[PDB]
Amino acid sequence: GYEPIFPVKRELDLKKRIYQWSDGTDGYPPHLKVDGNDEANLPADERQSKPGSARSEGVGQIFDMQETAFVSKIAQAVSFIIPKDIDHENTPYKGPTLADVEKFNKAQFPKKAADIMKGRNIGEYDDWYSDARFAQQHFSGVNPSTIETASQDKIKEYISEAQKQGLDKVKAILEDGKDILIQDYSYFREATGATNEQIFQNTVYELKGTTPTGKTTSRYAAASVVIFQLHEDGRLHPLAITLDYKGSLDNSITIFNRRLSPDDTCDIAEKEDWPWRYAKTVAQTADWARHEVATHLVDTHMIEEAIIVATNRIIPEGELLYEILSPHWFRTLSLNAAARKLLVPGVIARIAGFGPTSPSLDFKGNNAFKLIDWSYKNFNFQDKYIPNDLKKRGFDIKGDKSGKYKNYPYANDMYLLWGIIRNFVKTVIESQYTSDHVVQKDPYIGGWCKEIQTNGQIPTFPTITTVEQLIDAVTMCIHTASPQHTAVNYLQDYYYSFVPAKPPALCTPLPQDLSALQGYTEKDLTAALPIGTEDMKWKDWLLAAQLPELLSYKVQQDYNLITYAKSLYNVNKNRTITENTKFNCKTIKKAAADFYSHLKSAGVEFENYSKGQTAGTVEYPVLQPETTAISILI
Ligand SMILES: [Fe+2]
């Protein structure tokens, strides 16, 4: 005789040993436990191998050999006097003026530059500073998913502050209030637990090895609020920027646009309106933060890693849920390990203006980690289902025929792309989940929900009772891993390579009051940017510029959403679902024929939604299925 072997119980026991949760002492939300976040402490198959290797060896190479070496060289360089290696007679930060920097930038456009825009950045447009091209980023930039209808209380607040400054023209627009949109970063204070008297400051220290020399520099951030009007023709126009929101507008400092329609022209040109150009640069730091922390890192990288852990712990390999979800995980785990190790500490905490210091010792007391922590807690899995997302933020893509969202290619593209995926999920899911009863009698789904709700710390994940709830939930997992991440990741090089367009943080403190702001000149906007060889600003530009170069490297064809729709070949797991005779392989091949046929179709509609934008608007080519990654693999 022997010991009785339970195949499933044995498998899920070995998984709960390999895929353990982190305990939260490292300062991050719940993730895969990896001692010191080292490569060799990962599951054998989830760690990087040489390129061109058998999938068994590993996941190949996540980042560019040479690009990683550079970013590390930079983040390690901790003396304020730039190394001899990096030093050049001509660099993109040297300046000293904006003009000099803009001139260098355009010389560096080719003809690597191996992103989807091929080395072009928003600097190609001579009016990158403009209200049109600023405001458009909230719809077609790197963070197009946060913009929202203003509450009646935020409108009534700006009516009060406008009538206090004595601008009856703006008061009228807001008091009527047709299509008043908001971009609210005021939550940054409550997320870090900073009071309204306190101000965001990252004191960077100069080091010789480990020993600090007493010399420091400072980067500053702001809890900015931006109020827009969306016009009937589809153009988004910014009306007012609050620099740093502190409880009420009375206590904050709020500049209004001198141009109240996008067609307006004033005696002070946009290019020469330094008070407004500054106010825009401040809010471009607030969006940089919300993007790299909330929208990019939390709401895709870390939420998906929780799904990967919970699913590996609860649902056995060869189960249908495992075979539809697992393709969308390739490289994600080893990627996030490198992020917790190198990118968030060395780079994000360094170049952001939350602080309190760089370097740090305890990251638990570091406001960038308090923000990551807060964004993860305040994520809502069901409210970020595209149909729910759009309805909640006040965008009726479905029902509007006025061409008012013509310049919102994200919302147009996703509303379609969501349905295409959900259509593929429904057809495969209903292949075995024939009623609410089969879901309720399922061994793993109730425990899978509970695992993610509790251990994963995503209480907003549904208690799956019905086939509709299961389908939306599997969809949200694939949406998050593939298109939603592709959207917010693959345009980074374009909107960040030209730092002054969207800088990580300010290099000078905010003005004392509105009077001081109103007297701002070019010298004040140039001082606030990482321009010059002084104050270790070389480091701030090089990181701001090379981190996007590192992350924006264009997905190889094999790791595409459309190559999977074609073959259903799971790169991650090195098997194909329709070679598993257990499942209805005739239905799944049909679901994939339709999926692949829907993605070819969708590519033409995405192209058309980009071309349908207001003349001269920047293209939105990011959700092209050929350019959409199967998974969060960079
Ligand atoms: Fe990413």
Q: Which domains does the chain have, with CATH numbers?
A: 306-490+554-571+579-627 (1.20.245.10)
Residue 149 φ/ψ, nearest 5 degrees: -65, 135
Q: Which two tokens stand for residue 633?
A: 């693999």
Half-sphere exposure of 214 (CA within 13 A, CB side): 0
CA–CA separation, 630 and 225 (whole Å): 35
Distance from the alpha carbon of residue 289 to the mean position of ligand 1, in angstroms: 14
Residue 280 to residue 276: CA distance in whole angstroms: 6
Instruction: Please give the distance, rounded to the nearest whole angstrom, from the Cα atom of residue 548 to the centre of ligand 1.
Output: 10
Closest CA to 544 of 219, 200, 226, 301: 219
* Ligand 1 center–CA 420 separation, angstroms: 23
CB burial class (10 A; 0-12, 13-18, 19+) of residue 118? middle
Method for this entry = X-ray
Q: Do the Cβ atoms of 485 and 629 come closer than 8 Å?
A: yes
DSSP code of residue 573: T
Residue 246 and residue 196 in contact, taking contact as beta carbons nearer than 8 Å: yes
312 is in an annotated binding site: no
CA 502 to ligand 1 centroid distance, Å: 18
Q: Say how many Å lie between the CA of residue 631 and the centre of ligand 1.
A: 10
CA torsion 170-174-175-179 (nearest 10°) is 140
- Residue 510 CA, ligand 1 centroid: distance in Å: 31
Query: Does residue 580 contact residue 111 with C-beta atoms inside 8 Å?
Result: no
Residues ≥6 apart with Cβ < 8 Å to 578 = 568, 585, 588, 589, 592
The CA distance from 131 to 47, in Å, is 45
20 token code pair: 């353990």
Type of residue found at 545: A
Distance 480 CA to ligand 1 centre (A): 11
C-alpha 497/C-alpha 225 separation (Å) is 24
Could you give the CA distance from residue 197 to residue 195 in angstroms, rounded to a whole number?
Answer: 6
Instruction: Tokens 């304020």: give the residue.
Output: 80
124 CA to middle of ligand 1, Å?
A: 25
CB atoms near residue 47 (< 10 Å): 19
User: Are 340 and 478 in contact, with CB atoms under 8 Å apart?
Assistant: no
- Ligand 1 centroid distance, CA of 195 (Å): 32
Tell me the residue ranges of DSSP E strands in 397-481. none
Distance 489 CA to ligand 1 centre (A): 5
The reply to whether 291 sits in an annotated binding site is no
Gap from CA of 484 to ligand 1 centroid (Å)? 10
Using DSSP bridges, classify how beta strands 357-358 and 201-208 pair: parallel, antiparallel or unpaired.
parallel
* 270 CB-near residues (< 8 Å, 6+ apart): 127, 129, 130, 131, 259, 276, 277
| Amino acid symbol at 348 | I
How far is CA 224 from each of CA 26, 250, 282, 348, 446, rounded to the nearest angstrom? 29, 14, 7, 19, 41
Token pair, residue 250, equals 């009375």
- Which residue is listed with tokens 């990288």? 301
Amino acid at 297: L
CA–centroid distance, residue 191 to ligand 1 (Å): 22
Return d(Cα 224, Cα 399) in angstroms, integer.
Answer: 32
The alpha carbon of 340 and the centre of ligand 1 are apart by a number of angstroms equal to 12
Does 237 belong to an annotated binding site?
A: no
End-to-end CA separation in angstroms for the chain: 51
Q: For the range 270-275, what are the long-range contacts, defined as Cβ-Cβ under 8 Å and sequence gap of 24 or more?
A: 270/127, 270/129, 270/130, 270/131, 271/127, 271/129, 274/520, 274/521, 274/522, 274/524, 274/525, 275/517, 275/518, 275/519, 275/520
Residue 300 CA to ligand 1 center (angstroms) comes to: 8
| C-beta of residue 526 within 8 angstroms of C-beta of residue 507 | no
**How far does the centroid of ligand 1 lie from the alpha carbon of residue 372, in Å?**
15
Separation of CA 66 and ligand 1 centre (Å): 19
Question: What's the CA-to-centroid distance between 332 and ligand 1, angstroms?
Answer: 9
Residue 330 C-beta-side C-alpha neighbours within 13 Å: 29
Query: Does 31 carry a binding-site annotation?
Result: no
- Sign (positive or negative) of CA dihedral 583, 589, 595, 596: positive
In b/e form, how buried is each residue of 528-562, taking b as 16+ CB within 10 angstroms?
A: bbbbbbebbbbbbbbbbbbbbbbbbbbbeeebbbb
Cα of 436 to ligand 1 centre, how many Å?
Answer: 35
> Residue 156 and residue 161: Cα distance in Å, rounded?
9
328 DSSP 8-state letter: G
Q: Could you tell me if 21 and 319 are in contact, meaning their C-beta atoms sit under 8 angstroms apart?
A: no
Q: Is the peptide bond before 43 cis (omega within 30 degrees of 0)?
A: no
List, in order, residues 6 or more apart from 515 with CB less than 8 Å away: none
Cα 569 to ligand 1 centroid, rounded to whole Å: 23
Per the annotation, does 437 bind a ligand?
Answer: no
Q: Which residues, in sequence order, are CB contacts of 70 under 8 Å at separation 6+?
A: 546
**Closest by Cα among 152, 164, 140, 134 to 241:** 134
CA of 330 to the centre of ligand 1 (A): 13
Distances in whole angstroms, Cα of residue 483 to Cα of each of 376, 471, 603, 607, 629: 20, 17, 13, 16, 7
